[PDB]
Write a protein that binds this ligand. Structure first.
Ligand SMILES: [Mg+2]
Ligand SMILES: [Mg+2]
Ligand SMILES: [Mg+2]
Ligand SMILES: [Mg+2]
Ligand SMILES: [Mg+2]
Ligand SMILES: [Mg+2]
Ligand SMILES: [Mg+2]
Ligand SMILES: [Mg+2]
Ligand SMILES: [Mg+2]
Ligand SMILES: [Mg+2]
Ligand SMILES: [Mg+2]
Ligand SMILES: [Mg+2]
Ligand SMILES: [Mg+2]
Ligand SMILES: [Mg+2]
Ligand SMILES: [Mg+2]
Ligand SMILES: [Mg+2]
Lengths: 94, 85, 113, 200
RNA sequence: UUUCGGGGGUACUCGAGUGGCGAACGGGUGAGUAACACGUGGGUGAUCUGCCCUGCACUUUGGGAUAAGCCUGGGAAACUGGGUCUAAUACCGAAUACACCCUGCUGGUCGCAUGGCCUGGUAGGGGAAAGCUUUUGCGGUGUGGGAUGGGCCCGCGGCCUAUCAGCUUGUUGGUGGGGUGAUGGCCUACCAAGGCGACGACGGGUAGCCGGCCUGAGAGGGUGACCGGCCACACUGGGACUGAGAUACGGCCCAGACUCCUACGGGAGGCAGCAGUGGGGAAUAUUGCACAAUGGGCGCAAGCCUGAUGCAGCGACGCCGC
């Protein structure tokens, strides 16, 4: 009687990284763009839908997204202080 | 200083510090010697001392003085330096 | 090590215990990973319930029972089963269910009439 | 604690029979004291309050315990006034009185408290013990020949026994087929005023 | 064995000592903290994990010491030096490992860009161990998987104050190095001139957070005692060491305040553990009894330890019953 010398690891499903869409408000740093994300929440007490804007710093290697363009982003590990997003695709240039 | 076991541990912690310090110093001297060889530019000497330094890093990880991942990082950096230079 | 412990519930002089899977370091009345049973020693026979499916899983992965929990696992047969030894049926005693109240009401009706 | 002072003066203030056999009430149906004759200004609060006093000084329940009864009744799914009345009716000292083994609810309390009754074979000396469906109440051996209990055996007839109660034996064995509905309960009181009192 | 003053042996046993494991848990307090501290939901293709469980391989070979012991020195004390001597699962060199770590080349495949996976294939270099027991017998090393416990990052959520409008120069971003278990100005050199702010930045005030609790028809308001979960601290401030793991309450080093000892050279303390004392105050308890039960540490086990805990004492302090 003898068992296997190698035991394969159990399959874990790879997690769901968050995605977002925004507009580029800045590209004055090397390989980084500042993107504004827009969110709609219901006010806790008054119930009105409130629109809020969050700046995000995203990594793009090649500078392919300029100011004013609409872009898609995905979460990633910390690439520097602040930066936690990477540019996936420049979705609609303007 | 109040509890018997702590008093004994004072002695034993010191013994271990000395052992670990000595090993870490040896590792540091070895890495320094390799670095100087690479900055001097002598591929042959540098390659010989990469191998001895690398094995010393591995053995220090076996004694528990450094973490295996730290040994891997050091070894990787040295080998990359020799390939580039 | 992850262990199978008794955690104390109930009030003074009425110790009621839940059978929980918890890290050794966790305090007795602390957060548990699972509750897999209960144990009431003040009863006769002492009440014992174990979720045998979960007990088998936890012993499988290497949870270490405490001394009283090991006694309970032998009574239930979950220990003998896990090891492969015989006795898996266990020797669990259950309190004789007391007469139903409706039947005793009918008994009193008949007796006096 | 218990209220152990004069019993007639309470019925006299409230203007209704609480013991219901009381000659001194019918002789002086006005409130007690020097000013018991004088005209009292009407108020809704006094009416609500006195209905509560009639309830609690009939059954002999202190205000603390009575207020807990109210909260349970209001919590229960029925209508609060019916639930409150039948909870107080479930009390063992009351069940003993309704069965006839006692003369007054005061006498019923003392008997239950002194340890003369058993419920489903276990001694109970808690007057506030609430009977449930299919409870059987019996008398311990020592108290069966006990002189006032002997009186109670051959004094059957003072009042009628309600349908949910039943005395089945000369042993004076009481059976409870169910909790009384409002129709079954017969009490000289308007329960809606007490529900309103505690909604203040 | 005796003479009865003692003197040997045994190792059942065991003081002191070496060595292993534990001492990072458990218990306390809420000073600080307006912060990824906490709550809730995610991410890790960016990571560690002693003891426990379950596969595979192995456990070869040598060496030099030292505590204890004995002799002796210095010191008032705390403590400390020298000589001589002894052992190990203490320490140290080598072989073997080719699962594993590093580097070069190269094939397939999955994605979410770095990349991940196929223990992919291949060349070169390298990485361990420990014995004891004779009995329910316990151990040691590498490596695959699991279980447990974590680390780090992010969305969203919960105070007052513009009579606080600008703040920031490792500061915002990049590349080459360093550092860590791991990502990252975390650190560093150079280069670019950015980053955050009336969706209140930067200041000031207050405050541990939560499950919950109180009130209220609800919405809301107030609050966070006990019990339970996180966090923070341990005379004050700073620092690292040992370790799988450290705010290291009953560890270490330094500086300060305070108390104490001294031979004046120098030493020794830390109840926000349990109980208790003084003090402050309107006000809050016993210098109990047990490890019998439950949880924890070590031990093959018998067992030992446990002011965790289980209980007892005192106060109508509260609720409930009589
Ligand atoms: Mg590196
Ligand atoms: Mg009372
Ligand atoms: Mg000893
Ligand atoms: Mg601690
Ligand atoms: Mg060793
Ligand atoms: Mg780098
Ligand atoms: Mg504070
Ligand atoms: Mg309102
Ligand atoms: Mg360390
Ligand atoms: Mg202390
Ligand atoms: Mg300590
Ligand atoms: Mg104290
Ligand atoms: Mg005072
Ligand atoms: Mg135990
Ligand atoms: Mg045993
Ligand atoms: Mg002790």
């Amino acid at each position: 009687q003898k068992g296997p010398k190698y035991t394969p690891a159990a399959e874990k499903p790879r997690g769901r990284r968050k995605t977002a869409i925004g507009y580029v408000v800045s590209d004055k740093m090397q390989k980084t763009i500042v993107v504004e994300l827009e969110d709609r929440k219901s006010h806790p007490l008054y119930g009105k839908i409130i629109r809020t804007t969050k700046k995000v710093k995203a990594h793009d290697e090649n500078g392919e997204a300029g100011i004013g363009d609409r872009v898609s982003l995905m979460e990633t590990r910390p690439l520097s202080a602040t930066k936690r997003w990477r540019l996936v695709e420049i979705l609609e240039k303007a | 200083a109040n509890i018997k076991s702590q008093i004994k541990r004072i002695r034993t912690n010191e013994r271990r510090r000395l052992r670990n310090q000595s090993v870490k110093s040896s590792l540091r001297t070895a890495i320094r010697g390799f670095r100087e060889a690479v900055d001097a530019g002598d591929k042959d000497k540098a390659s010989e001392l990469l191998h001895a330094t690398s094995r010393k890093l591995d053995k220090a990880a076996s004694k528990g003085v450094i973490h295996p991942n730290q040994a891997a990082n050091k070894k990787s950096a040295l080998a990359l330096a020799l390939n580039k230079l | 090590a992850v262990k199978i412990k008794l955690t104390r519930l109930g009030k003074i002089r009425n110790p009621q215990y839940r059978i929980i899977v918890a890290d050794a370091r966790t305090r007795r009345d602390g957060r548990a990973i699972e509750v897999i049973g209960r144990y009431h020693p003040k009863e006769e026979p002492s009440l014992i319930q174990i979720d045998s499916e979960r007990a088998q899983y936890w012993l499988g992965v290497g949870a270490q029972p405490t001394e009283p929990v090991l006694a309970l696992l032998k009574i239930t047969g979950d220990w003998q089963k896990f090891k492969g030894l015989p006795g898996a049926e266990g020797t669990l005693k259950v309190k004789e269910p007391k007469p139903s109240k409706l039947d005793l009401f009918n008994a009193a009706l008949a007796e006096a009439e | 604690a218990r209220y152990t002072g004069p019993a007639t003066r309470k019925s006299r203030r409230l203007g209704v029979d609480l013991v219901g056999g009381d000659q001194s009430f019918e002789k002086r149906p006005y409130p007690p004291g020097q000013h018991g004759r004088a005209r009292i200004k009407e108020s809704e609060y006094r009416q609500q309050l006195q209905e509560k006093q009639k309830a609690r000084f009939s059954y002999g329940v202190m205000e603390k315990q009575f207020r807990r009864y109210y909260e349970e009744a209001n919590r229960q799914p029925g209508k609060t006034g019916d639930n409150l009345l039948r909870i107080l009716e479930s009390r063992l000292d009351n069940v003993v009185y309704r069965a006839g083994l006692a003369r007054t609810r005061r006498m019923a309390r003392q008997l239950v408290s002194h340890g003369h009754f058993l419920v489903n074979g276990v001694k109970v000396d808690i007057p506030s013990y609430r009977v449930s469906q299919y409870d059987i109440i019996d008398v311990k051996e020592k108290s069966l020949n006990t002189l006032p209990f002997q009186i109670a055996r051959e004094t059957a007839g003072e009042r009628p026994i309600p349908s949910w109660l039943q005395v089945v034996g000369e042993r004076q064995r009481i059976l409870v087929h169910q909790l009384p509905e409002r129709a079954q309960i017969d009490v000289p009181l308007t329960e809606q005023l007490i529900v309103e009192l505690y909604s203040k």
